[PDB]
Subunit: 66 residues, 2 copies
């Protein structure tokens, strides 16, 4: 969609996607209907996988470490 | 959340997440607020990364090949 993030992940490491409290309801739905959420494996380097996530601004992307 | 899928992905290979037409609006929002979407790198084997996706039933998970 709009926002962009690439992060390295190893085995057992993960990401959680959620909705922002501040944005309204119906507009996130429509975004997610128009622009989907795109997940991409860009490179694999050794024990590290680099994962791209492209999602609308209303979506919060959070590494599981937190 | 509820649904579960693990798929192998190599460099440049990706996945698109969207909302199902058939499910209503407000209940998917709440799911995505209660159960988020969980993305996990389970194993890295060579040129292949295995990616787990855990999401509510209202979310459609689609390999980019299609």
């Amino acid at each position: 969609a709009m926002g962009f993030l690439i992060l390295s992940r190893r085995e057992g490491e993960g990401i959680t996607l959620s909705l922002k409290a501040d944005y309204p309801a119906e507009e996130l739905i429509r975004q997610l209907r128009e622009g989907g959420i795109r997940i991409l494996v860009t490179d694999i380097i050794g024990n590290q996988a680099r994962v791209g996530i492209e999602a609308p601004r209303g979506v919060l992307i959070v590494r599981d470490e937190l």
